[PDB]
Design a protein around this ligand. Structure first.
Ligand code: ADP
Ligand code: MG
Ligand code: MG
Ligand code: MG
Lengths: 312, 50, 313, 309, 312, 312, 312, 48
DNA sequence: CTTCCTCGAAGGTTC
DNA sequence: GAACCTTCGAGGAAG
């Protein structure tokens, strides 16, 4: 597989990687299970990969499932019963399961036992089941989406974040050897700068640039070739996609920078309003190209000069 | 009696009476407790994977 | 031609067409199938025909189905056996497929095999079925609701766009040769200008003008006949119908450009709220003649200079 | 009968009527079926009537159904299996069909075949050339793909005083009631531009002449009958006149809000907005404003008050 | 009985009563069914009572149902086809019928036929069901809630008006003979002038006076008993309730006549904004005691001369 | 018990009791059911309690339900079928019923029948249910939400007033006799003045004082123990809370009595804009501590002496 | 275990403990349940723990659930039928309970009965359920958000506040003693000052510091180690979280210090309004970092001198 | 062959087919000796 | 998918 | 120019 197997191989995330090393080894000295851990952050940063690294460092076999895969308490209780001391359970999209399940997860996490109440009408009894010690790992895209009482049970937080140019260049250079591709240290930097911090975007661009170099060139990805290929893919030198450029161009030419409402903008370009606000605005906001106001979105001065228009 | 207790526990977890009975009826151990039966009726129905 | 065999014959879509040409040729230089492709765009531009051309370029057999027609995992798995090595599978409206099937497609797309799990406990077993290499081509209108795992499998994204006047004119010309009518190049441009950039609307106008030219004329579509036909119909030189023109005039003449509410505007033109909001209002926004605001619709400067009225801030 | 049978009997609608004649004549000359036609517009203008006229001019038998009567895909599959070459299918209130039925119908319109599943089994049909005619009041409620399949769009418009005058005279001959030329004009002015209202007023006047007169409609009986019904010469009802009067005499012409005006006349808020105001706004007696509504100069002149800007 | 049965007994509504007499008599000379009639207007003015009078004067059977009872097209299709030639169908609260059901009447009222789906599977058929001549009658308080294509199909419209003091006095005297009580003519006028113009309120006051006259008196209603009974109920000689008087007094003594906002006045009387605007304010405006303006409510001179203050 | 059972036990509401007595006695002489009656007014003044008193004075089996319990018309029809002649049906919170169900009572209250659709669906028809004579009693906190046609059908309207100190003092004494606690008249008057005129509040304060008086007292509620206990609860001798005291003080110490706007003052007290207007301002205006004016609100002289500042 | 079980073990909240002791003790001489109690205040202060203490002092069983978990009235009825006499029911987040559900508690709390419709079709009937005596304990952050009908039925109100340094320091020393650990007095004081006055945070930080001292230290916590450990985490030298930093770093740069509305700020920082409104804003306000103004919040000079900007 | 026959029927049910239809579908196949993969492949192919 | 209704913006008067 | 009051318009959530 392309994903790393140990912290020595895992590139980037120095903060998260440094913290987990201390917490993992401290648990070994006491010969006890690691505390419940929550990983969160933008998609594609390596959350799923990190879960396997933790299990390998602990020396346990990982168990994996997902939010939509669990639908009734019997599902979770069955999975929990089939555990061995120290087993690690990974639940992706932990925030999407039904609340009827959360009612049981609380005591499982905190008490390591469940007590199934049973009876009808006046009758009421319960049976308690012991659970072997386990470590839960959850992952989400946002921290606040998680249930407030559930979030309080996670004793370790892991905030993932975008990679920097040095780390992405090391990733780009490595992957190229798997394809038997010759890439210069300069070309690998251009692709890195334009991948906007996401490892799978860089890998997806590299696969596409390879095809161009094998036809419009001599199979060597040069700086001169990568620049021609990236303009053929319609990827801006700031990493703006085809749709990203369409949004900014429309605001400047048709509305003088706004303000403009989401409904008007989403109808001018043939897009669904749920797409614009979820996929594209988050990047343009963090990078400072668009700002939100009660009257609508506005194109900042930075955006005006990048697109190449005379500012007011 | 532990059979009905085990079936009653599986009913609370959301299994239908037919399946809970069929699940528990597959298990048989006169000395087992409803708790040790419960931990078997589910283990016998989950698909283990490697 | 209307039914194109190769990219050399497909009219328009030069951006997506140029990109696919390089990817197909690079794939042909190796004994590999083309990467999974996803097509985006508004409804009615021709995505179905584009998939057929891709198969002819690769020299492969094409299978065609749709998202709604697949109800259970067995439906998809049975179709995959029908594929020969390198076949193309086209799925329309891929966003409507039920999740029970979606989770089976991941392993098939990534590994070209499917694993079926059966039994329980100590009897748990799995059977492994190999699949021949294939290229999945998906098309969707609502790209924003595909799950992230599915989008991660697709390696090529293509965006369709509305046709421009130099290309939409050729579709009229070519279509005029399917019927038996001569059309002057100057007249073909007048129909394209009003076709809103959509091939379906261009065909409809030509049919209505054809009927007029053979009942009110000599059976030839000259500029003089086109002028009369486009005068019987209400469509103006920008493609605005009669009702479109009445809306813009009313806002400028009675409300001074707005803001004006949807209900107040509806009762003035004697139409239902749903009719103005869904039939007429969507195109006026794309054309840049009106904006929607927290307080109501407002006419823009571009609308004033088109209707011919003085404008003031 | 009351419903005209041919274009020579269909008074008015010169725009839609002129266009339909060109398209119908061209289709016959080629021995082809007519394109799919959509008819839409306000209530009572002639949509349902025109559907039967089209069939009589084409010389075909009209198959008729309605939207509310179709509830499942199996219903439409049964109906379409009865069509013969050149048949015309008319669906009234087409905006009510379920979404699952629309997808089936717009497929047949394009490719003339059906391939659907209906214990489940497939159904496949090959359809002959046919024309679908739809009539609706809520065209904006139809899906965007379906509206694109129709090749002809007919939008109905209100009638003029010369046209309505002729309709009143025509209907009078069916009831075999004698009416004078100037008396027929008095019913036209008050009919608000709609044929159904013109026919309604004629019925109410006929009933009066048979009891309070000599059974003949004349310029004197009509004036008495219209005084009993209390319909103004502009067509304003008693309640419509009370609104304008209250605005001019208690609020100096406005602006005033909808809530204040409703409570002052002892009427329900929803009734004033949806039943009485729409005609007053289209005739130009009232204006809506960001701060309320105001009576225009036309209202002052009609009610007989001194206007002040 | 408490409801009149013929036009000889139905007091008032001269405008509506005059029209119906002419149309009913003309319909008999032609020996044909009466056109469809819609009755609407304020509550308690005689809408339901008139529906029975029409049937008795036409001399036909009356079939009765209500809007809240019908919920699906199958229910209406069952009421139809149970009609005989010349039957009258009366629907009360017709504004409640679902819109998908009203669209079934469009064909029935205009052409006396409906389209039905019959058979099953391959045997399914669409057949015309044809109805005999009949008269639909509807009564509603919310006429503006009916669809425009339905209101256009009714051929006769009756709008009800409030009654005058001469008519209400006669109604009180009539009702006083259904029960067994003697009432002086000058006392009946005293109750009528306090009944706000509504027959149902005039009957309610009489019932409350009767209870007092037989417990606190000799069983007869006279000016002396009426004044005492009306003092217990605390109804002003103009019909103003206890809370109505409190509103005017507060406006004249604290705010000098206004302008004052609805909120400020509600809090001063310990009421709640929704009760004042919906129960009490409507009658005060319709009777000229209060005037609504952009700045707030204002008390008119008529209120000053009623409460006894000086219109300074 | 806490709830009175007969008019002899029900203190206060003289205006309502006097009327209800006459109407109940007159109904008995005629051997008829009581007219439908609607009870409304502020919360906690005795509406629910009075409904039980009426049943005991009439001497019949009270049948009880609630507005929010009736989910659909099928439920209401089932309830009405269980009625026996003369039964009383009580519906608390009658304003919570849905409009589609409220319109079913229109026929039941005036004509004692219901139109119901019956049959499998192949064959179905309407039928008249005929109800026995019965009395409907409704209770609501906001009559302004009931539709005009429903409110007009109730024949007896009772509006609940606030209690005065003489009457409210007797309620505190009566309640102590049930708890067997000795309370001196000097202390009973102190509890009454702080109860804001509401019986529910008076009973609550007495319970809390009783607990304190028996854990750190001699078991007698004397004039000294009551003051100490109320000091712990932080209830001013006018019933103001700390929040209210902060408001009145702020207007004097930072604004010299105002006028000050609601938005400006809200910031100075860390209170939400609408909370202050909905929760705390109403009682301060009714007691005369604050006065609304066209330019803002002003603290009156009464508020000065209550806080001890120098009025100017 | 960490969670206290008796009042002698519950540190702080002196104002609340004193009241609860008297009421609980008085409720033990008499044989009755405790009056319904409402606990409100900032999250994480220990109100759930207080419910366990009450149950242990009363000597009864405690059942726990939450508002958002109850979807329909039938769910709450099933729960109420599962309580034995004198049991305690704890409902958290009670302010988000649906309106259709809350309407059931009004009768349960006041009289212990519920009116319910049971059966279906012809079997539908009304039943008068009866409940055994029980004590409801409700916890909410937004006391002012409760409806007037519900807030008036609680008999005891408890306001909880942030702990001071003498209290938090004792909690850290206690917790560091349950684990076999040693902490110097200077370290425990610094660790408390960094803990936002909130016990939930102080306990979580102590665990992570212990892990650091075991692997990267000599197994003993000293001021030098605590400063380093807390510097490896994002905890600022005065407890500001990374989220707190982003808020302050945003108000000064994107809005020039304000005033700015919290609504638009939330969407610009990519955070849920409730989290910033209930977990972050209260601390920054009570500590002078943010101040309220009619137009919105503004950053104070203390914030500028903390982040290192110039208060120009 | 009953081992493969039972597997093929059970696997086909896992694909969402009903237990009844899966038994019939497999019973319609001719060759018993071929492994479950061939049997399941033919079952799906024949139903297309 | 639909009907109701509540939250917000802004025009206008007055001090 | 700070404070009150009336009016309209677009969302959204409870059937
Ligand atoms: N390049 C083109 N040349 C000729 N006709 C075209 C072209 N693009 C679209 N059309 C026409 O427009 C319609 C496109 O339909 P279709 O291909 O099904 O659209 P989509 O697949 O995008 O839904 C057809 O009538 C087709 O003939
Ligand atoms: Mg029609
Ligand atoms: Mg009635
Ligand atoms: Mg009550």
């Amino acid at each position: 597989t392309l994903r790393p197997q140990y912290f020595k191989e895992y590139i980037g995330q120095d903060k998260v990687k440094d913290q987990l090393k201390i917490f993992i080894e401290a648990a070994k000295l006491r010969d006890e299970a690691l505390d419940h851990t929550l990983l969160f952050g933008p998609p594609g940063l390596g959350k799923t990969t990190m879960a396997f690294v933790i299990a390998n460092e602990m020396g346990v076999n990982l168990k994996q499932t997902s939010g939509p895969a669990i639908e009734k308490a019997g599902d979770l209780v069955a999975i929990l019963n089939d555990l061995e001391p120290g087993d690690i359970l990974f639940i992706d999209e932990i925030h999407r399961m039904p609340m009827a399940v959360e009612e049981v997860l609380y005591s499982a996490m905190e008490d390591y036992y469940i007590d199934i109440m049973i009876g009808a009408g006046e009758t009421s009894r319960s049976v308690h089941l012991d659970l072997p010690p386990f470590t839960l790992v959850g992952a989400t895209t946002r921290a606040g989406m998680l249930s407030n009482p559930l979030r309080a049970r996670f004793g370790i937080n892991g905030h993932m974040e975008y990679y920097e140019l040095p780390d992405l260049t090391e990733i780009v250079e490595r992957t190229s050897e798997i394809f038997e591709m010759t890439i210069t240290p300069e070309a690998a930097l251009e692709l890195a700068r334009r991948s906007r911090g996401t490892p799978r975007i860089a890998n997806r661009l590299l696969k596409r640039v390879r095809d161009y170099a094998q036809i419009m060139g001599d199979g060597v990805i040069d700086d001169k070739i990568a620049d021609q290929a990236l303009t053929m893919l319609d990827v801006d030198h700031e990493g703006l996609d085809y749709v990203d450029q369409k949004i900014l161009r429309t605001m400047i030419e048709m509305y003088g920078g706004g303000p403009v409402g989401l409904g008007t903008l989403s109808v001018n370009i043939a897009e669904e309003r749920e797409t614009v606000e979820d996929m594209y605005e988050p990047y343009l906001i963090q990078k400072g190209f668009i700002m939100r106001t009660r009257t609508g979105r506005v194109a900042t001065a930075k955006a005006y000069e990048h697109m190449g228009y005379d500012y007011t | 009696d532990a059979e009905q207790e085990a079936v009653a526990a599986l009913v609370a977890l959301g299994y239908k009476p037919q399946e809970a009975s069929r699940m528990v009826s597959k298990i048989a151990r006169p000395d087992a407790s409803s708790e040790t039966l419960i931990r078997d009726a589910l283990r016998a129905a989950l698909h283990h994977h490697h």
